[PDB]
């Protein structure tokens, strides 16, 4: 997999963000995770976590996996990095997302994220509290 440039246009919620990629505005949905909806418990905290991580970064990058790059809603499907740190992983490690939506051939970082989830769960963080 390869990291490619993007810039933040606007935060949305815990697992989606509006980024400019190859010069075009796109909504990106984070691979292999699920955050609670803003309306749900830990939803606000996940949104805030993502927003801060992406807004504070000097460098945003997107990394597509091996399979489909857009979902049925036209959202980009990627791993998103903020100054080299993977947002997807960070949400899972903080107990602010569950590993989810693991479809074959877009699952390169599955084991990495399941390891973070196990740690979050052992620590009883947030969703696991
Ligand atoms: C994360 C992800 C979601 N999706 C689709 C599945 C779900 O369809 P449904 O809308 O039919 O439930 C929806 C979940 O996204 P949200 O969690 O953003 O709602 O997005 C993909 O198709 N591929 C993916 O990799
Ligand atoms: Ca969600």
UniProtKB/Swiss-Prot annotation:
Positions of region (Disordered): 109-129
Record's subcellular location: Secreted
Extent of Basic and acidic residues compositional bias: 109-125
Coiled coil (UniProt feature): none
Catalytic residues (UniProt): 29, 37, 75
Binding site for Ca(2+): 15, 34-35
Domain of life: Bacteria
Regions that span the bilayer: none
Protein name, entry field: Nuclease A
Organism field: Staphylococcus aureus
Organism placement in taxonomy: Bacteria, Bacillati, Bacillota, Bacilli, Bacillales
Gene label: nuc
